[PDB]
Coordinates of C-alpha atoms in Angstrom, one line a residue:
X1 CA 19.9 9.1 14.4
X2 CA 18.2 7.1 11.7
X3 CA 20.5 4.1 11.3
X4 CA 19.0 2.1 14.1
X5 CA 15.5 2.9 12.8
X6 CA 16.5 1.7 9.4
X7 CA 18.2 -1.3 11.0
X8 CA 14.8 -2.6 12.3
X9 CA 13.3 -2.2 8.9
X10 CA 16.3 -4.1 7.3
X11 CA 15.9 -7.0 9.7
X12 CA 12.1 -7.1 9.3
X13 CA 12.4 -7.0 5.5
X14 CA 15.1 -9.7 5.3
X15 CA 13.0 -12.1 7.4
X16 CA 9.8 -11.2 5.5
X17 CA 11.4 -12.0 2.2
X18 CA 12.1 -15.5 3.4
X19 CA 8.6 -16.0 4.8
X20 CA 6.6 -14.3 2.0
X21 CA 8.6 -16.2 -0.7
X22 CA 7.2 -14.7 -3.9
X23 CA 4.1 -13.4 -2.3
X24 CA 3.3 -9.7 -1.6
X25 CA 2.2 -8.0 1.6
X26 CA -0.8 -5.7 1.6
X27 CA -2.2 -4.9 5.1
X28 CA -2.4 -6.7 8.4
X29 CA -5.7 -7.7 9.8
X30 CA -5.8 -7.7 13.6
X31 CA -2.3 -9.2 14.2
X32 CA 1.4 -8.5 13.5
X33 CA 1.2 -10.6 10.3
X34 CA 0.6 -9.2 6.8
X35 CA -2.2 -10.6 4.7
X36 CA -0.5 -11.6 1.4
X37 CA -1.5 -11.8 -2.3
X38 CA 0.0 -13.2 -5.5
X39 CA 0.5 -9.7 -7.1
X40 CA -3.1 -8.9 -7.6
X41 CA -3.8 -5.6 -5.8
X42 CA -2.8 -1.9 -6.1
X43 CA -0.2 -2.1 -3.4
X44 CA 2.3 -4.7 -4.6
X45 CA 4.8 -2.2 -5.8
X46 CA 5.4 -0.9 -2.3
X47 CA 7.0 -4.2 -1.4
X48 CA 9.3 -3.9 -4.4
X49 CA 10.1 -0.4 -3.4
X50 CA 11.1 -1.5 0.2
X51 CA 13.4 -4.2 -1.2
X52 CA 15.1 -1.7 -3.5
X53 CA 15.5 0.9 -0.7
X54 CA 17.0 -1.8 1.5
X55 CA 19.4 -2.8 -1.3
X56 CA 20.5 0.8 -1.9
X57 CA 21.2 1.3 1.9
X58 CA 23.1 -2.0 2.4
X59 CA 24.4 -3.2 -1.0
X60 CA 23.3 -6.6 0.3
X61 CA 22.2 -8.7 -2.7
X62 CA 19.6 -10.7 -0.8
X63 CA 17.4 -7.6 -1.1
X64 CA 18.3 -7.0 -4.8
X65 CA 17.6 -10.5 -5.8
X66 CA 14.2 -10.4 -4.0
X67 CA 13.4 -7.2 -5.8
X68 CA 14.4 -8.6 -9.2
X69 CA 12.1 -11.6 -8.5
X70 CA 9.2 -9.2 -7.9
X71 CA 10.0 -7.4 -11.2
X72 CA 9.7 -10.8 -13.0
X73 CA 6.3 -11.2 -11.3
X74 CA 5.3 -7.7 -12.6
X75 CA 6.4 -8.6 -16.1
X76 CA 4.1 -11.6 -16.0
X77 CA 1.3 -9.6 -14.4
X78 CA 1.4 -7.2 -17.3
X79 CA 1.5 -9.9 -20.0
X80 CA -1.6 -11.5 -18.4
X81 CA -3.0 -8.0 -17.7
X82 CA -4.2 -9.1 -14.3
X83 CA -6.1 -6.4 -12.4
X84 CA -4.5 -3.4 -14.3
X85 CA -7.7 -1.7 -15.4
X86 CA -7.1 1.2 -12.9
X87 CA -4.8 4.2 -12.4
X88 CA -2.4 2.8 -9.8
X89 CA -0.1 1.5 -12.5
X90 CA 2.5 4.0 -11.2
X91 CA 2.5 2.7 -7.6
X92 CA 2.9 -0.8 -9.1
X93 CA 5.6 -0.2 -11.7
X94 CA 7.5 2.9 -10.7
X95 CA 8.6 1.2 -7.5
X96 CA 9.5 -2.1 -9.1
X97 CA 10.5 -1.8 -12.8
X98 CA 11.4 1.8 -13.0
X99 CA 13.2 1.5 -9.7
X100 CA 15.5 -1.2 -11.1
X101 CA 16.3 1.1 -14.0
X102 CA 17.1 3.9 -11.6
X103 CA 19.2 1.6 -9.4
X104 CA 21.2 -0.4 -12.0
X105 CA 20.1 0.7 -15.4
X106 CA 18.6 -2.7 -16.4
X107 CA 17.3 -2.2 -19.9
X108 CA 14.6 -5.0 -19.6
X109 CA 13.3 -3.2 -16.5
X110 CA 13.1 0.1 -18.4
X111 CA 11.1 -1.6 -21.2
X112 CA 8.7 -3.0 -18.6
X113 CA 8.2 0.4 -17.0
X114 CA 7.6 1.9 -20.4
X115 CA 5.2 -0.9 -21.3
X116 CA 3.4 -0.1 -18.0
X117 CA 3.3 3.7 -18.8
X118 CA 1.6 2.7 -22.1
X119 CA -1.0 0.8 -20.1
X120 CA -1.6 3.7 -17.8
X121 CA -2.1 6.0 -20.8
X122 CA -5.0 3.7 -21.7
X123 CA -6.9 5.2 -18.7
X124 CA -6.9 8.7 -20.3
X125 CA -10.4 9.9 -21.4
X126 CA -9.9 12.5 -24.1
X127 CA -13.5 13.6 -23.9
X128 CA -13.3 14.3 -20.1
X129 CA -9.7 15.4 -20.0
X130 CA -8.9 13.0 -17.1
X131 CA -7.3 9.7 -16.2
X132 CA -10.1 7.4 -15.0
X133 CA -9.3 5.9 -11.6
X134 CA -11.2 2.6 -11.6
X135 CA -13.5 0.4 -13.6
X136 CA -13.7 -0.2 -17.4
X137 CA -14.1 2.7 -19.8
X138 CA -17.6 3.9 -19.9
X139 CA -18.3 2.6 -16.4
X140 CA -21.7 4.1 -15.5
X141 CA -20.6 4.9 -12.0
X142 CA -16.9 5.4 -12.2
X143 CA -16.4 6.3 -15.9
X144 CA -15.5 9.9 -15.1
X145 CA -14.2 9.7 -11.6
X146 CA -10.7 10.7 -10.5
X147 CA -9.1 10.0 -7.2
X148 CA -6.3 12.1 -5.6
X149 CA -3.8 9.3 -5.4
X150 CA -3.5 9.5 -9.2
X151 CA -1.1 12.3 -8.6
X152 CA 1.6 9.9 -7.5
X153 CA 1.0 7.8 -10.6
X154 CA 1.7 10.6 -13.0
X155 CA 5.4 10.3 -12.4
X156 CA 5.4 7.0 -14.3
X157 CA 4.0 8.9 -17.3
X158 CA 6.3 12.0 -16.9
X159 CA 9.3 9.7 -16.7
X160 CA 8.2 7.8 -19.8
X161 CA 7.8 11.1 -21.7
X162 CA 11.4 12.1 -20.8
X163 CA 12.6 8.6 -21.8
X164 CA 10.8 8.5 -25.2
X165 CA 10.6 12.1 -26.1
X166 CA 6.9 11.7 -26.8
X167 CA 5.2 15.0 -25.6
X168 CA 1.8 13.2 -25.2
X169 CA 2.9 11.8 -21.8
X170 CA 3.6 15.3 -20.3
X171 CA 0.5 16.7 -21.9
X172 CA -1.8 14.1 -20.3
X173 CA -0.1 14.3 -16.9
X174 CA -0.1 18.1 -16.8
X175 CA -3.8 18.2 -17.8
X176 CA -4.8 15.8 -15.1
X177 CA -2.6 17.4 -12.4
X178 CA -4.1 20.9 -13.1
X179 CA -7.7 19.5 -13.2
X180 CA -7.0 17.8 -9.8
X181 CA -5.7 21.1 -8.4
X182 CA -8.9 22.9 -9.5
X183 CA -11.4 20.4 -8.3
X184 CA -9.9 18.1 -5.7
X185 CA -8.3 20.8 -3.6
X186 CA -10.7 23.0 -1.5
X187 CA -10.7 26.7 -0.7
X188 CA -9.6 26.2 2.9
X189 CA -6.6 24.1 1.7
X190 CA -8.3 20.8 2.6
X191 CA -9.2 18.3 -0.2
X192 CA -11.8 15.9 -1.6
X193 CA -10.9 12.3 -1.9
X194 CA -12.4 11.8 -5.4
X195 CA -14.2 13.9 -8.0
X196 CA -16.8 13.1 -10.7
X197 CA -16.8 14.5 -14.2
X198 CA -19.3 14.1 -17.1
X199 CA -17.7 11.3 -19.3
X200 CA -19.0 13.0 -22.4
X201 CA -17.6 16.5 -22.0
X202 CA -15.6 16.7 -18.8
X203 CA -18.0 19.1 -16.9
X204 CA -17.5 19.0 -13.2
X205 CA -20.2 17.1 -11.4
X206 CA -19.3 16.7 -7.7
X207 CA -16.6 15.7 -5.2
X208 CA -17.0 12.8 -2.8
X209 CA -15.6 9.8 -1.1
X210 CA -16.3 6.2 0.0
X211 CA -13.4 6.3 2.4
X212 CA -13.5 9.7 4.0
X213 CA -15.9 10.3 6.9
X214 CA -18.2 12.4 4.6
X215 CA -18.0 13.8 1.0
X216 CA -16.9 17.1 2.5
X217 CA -14.5 15.8 5.2
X218 CA -10.7 15.6 5.1
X219 CA -9.5 12.0 4.8
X220 CA -5.9 12.3 6.0
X221 CA -4.3 9.9 3.5
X222 CA -6.0 11.8 0.8
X223 CA -4.6 15.1 2.0
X224 CA -1.2 13.3 2.2
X225 CA -1.4 12.1 -1.4
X226 CA -2.1 15.7 -2.4
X227 CA 1.0 17.0 -0.5
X228 CA 3.5 14.6 -2.0
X229 CA 1.7 14.2 -5.3
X230 CA 1.5 17.9 -6.2
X231 CA 5.1 18.3 -5.2
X232 CA 6.2 15.5 -7.4
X233 CA 4.3 17.0 -10.3
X234 CA 5.7 20.5 -9.7
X235 CA 9.2 19.1 -10.0
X236 CA 8.6 17.4 -13.3
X237 CA 6.5 20.2 -14.8
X238 CA 8.4 23.1 -13.2
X239 CA 5.0 24.5 -12.1
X240 CA 5.2 26.9 -9.2
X241 CA 1.4 26.8 -8.8
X242 CA 1.4 23.1 -8.1
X243 CA 4.2 23.6 -5.6
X244 CA 2.2 26.4 -3.9
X245 CA -0.7 24.0 -3.6
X246 CA 1.5 21.3 -2.1
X247 CA 2.7 23.9 0.5
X248 CA -0.9 25.0 1.3
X249 CA -2.0 21.5 1.8
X250 CA 1.0 20.7 3.9
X251 CA 0.4 23.6 6.3
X252 CA -3.3 22.6 6.6
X253 CA -2.2 19.1 7.5
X254 CA 0.5 20.2 9.9
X255 CA -1.9 22.5 11.8
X256 CA -4.0 19.5 12.6
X257 CA -1.4 17.0 13.8
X258 CA -2.3 15.7 17.3
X259 CA -0.2 15.6 20.4
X260 CA 1.8 12.5 19.7
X261 CA 2.7 13.7 16.2
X262 CA 0.7 11.2 14.1
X263 CA -2.7 12.0 12.6
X264 CA -6.1 10.5 13.0
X265 CA -7.8 8.9 9.9
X266 CA -9.9 12.0 9.1
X267 CA -9.5 15.6 10.4
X268 CA -13.2 16.1 10.7
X269 CA -14.0 13.4 13.3
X270 CA -13.3 13.5 17.1
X271 CA -9.6 14.2 17.4
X272 CA -9.2 12.0 20.5
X273 CA -7.5 8.6 21.2
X274 CA -10.8 6.8 20.7
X275 CA -10.6 7.5 17.0
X276 CA -8.5 5.4 14.6
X277 CA -5.2 6.8 13.4
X278 CA -3.5 6.5 10.0
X279 CA 0.2 6.4 10.5
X280 CA 0.5 5.9 6.7
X281 CA -0.8 9.5 6.1
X282 CA 1.9 10.8 8.3
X283 CA 4.6 8.7 6.6
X284 CA 3.4 9.9 3.1
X285 CA 3.4 13.5 4.4
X286 CA 7.0 13.2 5.8
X287 CA 8.2 12.4 2.3
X288 CA 6.1 15.1 0.8
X289 CA 7.5 17.7 3.2
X290 CA 11.1 16.7 2.2
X291 CA 10.2 16.8 -1.5
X292 CA 8.7 20.3 -1.1
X293 CA 11.9 21.5 0.8
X294 CA 14.1 20.1 -2.0
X295 CA 12.4 22.5 -4.4
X296 CA 12.8 25.7 -2.3
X297 CA 15.8 28.0 -2.4
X298 CA 18.0 27.8 0.6
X299 CA 17.4 31.5 1.3
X300 CA 13.7 30.7 1.9
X301 CA 13.3 30.5 5.7
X302 CA 10.4 28.0 5.3
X303 CA 12.7 25.5 3.7
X304 CA 14.3 24.5 7.0
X305 CA 10.8 24.6 8.6
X306 CA 9.6 22.0 6.2
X307 CA 12.7 19.8 6.7
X308 CA 12.3 20.1 10.5
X309 CA 8.6 19.3 10.3
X310 CA 9.5 16.1 8.3
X311 CA 12.2 15.1 10.9
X312 CA 9.6 15.7 13.7
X313 CA 7.1 13.5 11.8
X314 CA 9.6 10.7 11.3
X315 CA 10.7 10.9 15.0
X316 CA 7.1 10.7 16.1
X317 CA 6.6 7.6 14.0
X318 CA 9.8 6.0 15.2
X319 CA 9.0 6.7 18.9
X320 CA 5.3 5.9 19.1
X321 CA 4.6 3.6 16.1
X322 CA 7.7 1.8 14.8
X323 CA 8.1 -1.9 15.3
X324 CA 11.4 -3.3 16.6
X325 CA 12.6 -6.4 14.8
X326 CA 11.6 -8.9 17.4
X327 CA 11.7 -11.8 15.0
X328 CA 7.9 -11.9 14.6
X329 CA 6.6 -8.4 13.6
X330 CA 6.2 -8.1 9.8
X331 CA 5.5 -4.3 9.6
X332 CA 7.5 -1.2 10.1
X333 CA 4.9 1.1 11.7
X334 CA 1.7 0.3 13.6
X335 CA -1.8 1.9 13.5
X336 CA -2.2 2.5 9.8
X337 CA -5.8 2.2 8.5
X338 CA -7.1 0.9 5.2
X339 CA -10.9 1.4 5.1
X340 CA -12.2 2.6 8.5
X341 CA -15.7 3.2 7.2
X342 CA -15.9 -0.4 5.9
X343 CA -14.3 -1.8 9.0
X344 CA -11.4 -3.1 7.0
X345 CA -8.0 -3.1 8.8
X346 CA -8.5 0.2 10.7
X347 CA -5.6 -0.3 13.1
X348 CA -3.0 -2.2 11.1
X349 CA 0.2 -2.3 9.1
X350 CA -0.2 -1.0 5.6
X351 CA 2.6 -1.7 3.1
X352 CA 2.3 1.8 1.6
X353 CA 2.8 3.3 5.1
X354 CA 5.9 1.1 5.5
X355 CA 7.3 2.1 2.2
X356 CA 6.9 5.8 2.8
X357 CA 8.3 5.5 6.3
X358 CA 11.4 3.8 4.9
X359 CA 11.7 6.3 2.0
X360 CA 11.6 9.2 4.5
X361 CA 14.4 7.5 6.5
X362 CA 16.5 6.9 3.4
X363 CA 15.9 10.6 2.3
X364 CA 17.1 11.8 5.7
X365 CA 20.0 9.4 6.1
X366 CA 21.3 9.0 2.6
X367 CA 19.6 11.5 0.4
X368 CA 18.0 8.6 -1.5
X369 CA 14.7 10.0 -2.9
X370 CA 12.9 6.8 -4.0
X371 CA 11.8 6.0 -7.5
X372 CA 9.4 8.7 -8.7
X373 CA 12.1 10.3 -10.8
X374 CA 15.7 9.8 -11.9
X375 CA 18.4 10.6 -9.3
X376 CA 19.5 14.2 -9.3
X377 CA 17.2 14.9 -12.3

């Protein structure tokens, strides 16, 4: 079943909240403890998301109150504009502020999410037709660079558009999603991690990565962002081409899943136990597979195959990577990897991996779909 798997996450989270205090987990670094920050990275929202998911599952207010405290932290982060000059505003605010709006319709949370969407819109570069991933506008190196994870940040914009009625949100999100499909996805259904465009006109320059093994390899977390990301955008935009792309990327991913059911950090490196894994890529994909399935007609025989593939992925994670609540462990799943090439936490907990693992469990057990879009939209 999924209840006991969720149970370990619930225990770990309740204990973590009392240990972390108002701090946020990011990744572990050689031990079963998370390295923490004061809401200054791109991953802080995943902690908020975990707290909200735990609350939705239990109705236990210790989780809600912790989540509300993180939302207060995000309100302050925005007012001080601390490290928000990047495109991961969605990861940060959809899972915290927007989540509170989805869970209990808190108007102040809704305002914060909209204020955040406004900030993300500031990353749009009209001349290049893209949302700049990192660095200040005009950055000589990153001024016209997009990264595939931006796809999961578009939901914040799409949601804001549906809340305000301002067509500009959807226009920008749609343009970026389509440009990502054309240049980040490859002809063999694999994908580039990032792509560079001329800041002045938007002409395509080249694809590449600082995380994947090589510019032309297939970094598994990147492939995973594509699977879930394109599916989330296909739902909002009602675009069958984006859904087709998510399915193509999903099949490419699934065909390269190793024996134990959890992927290595890159598909183009030795696929043997000696290579680092990335349990987070498998967790993200599990959610993406379920999102894809939810958009297919029940008469489609592949719908059940996507659902079963997701269940198989979650089972593989639970059996070979999930941590039991032993009163010490602070993460849900082991062997995630942050930056293998840089030697940064290559075999550790990753808060995003934990969030997606828990979202997959909630999707399977309660039909709870997270905070990328309004329930039963």
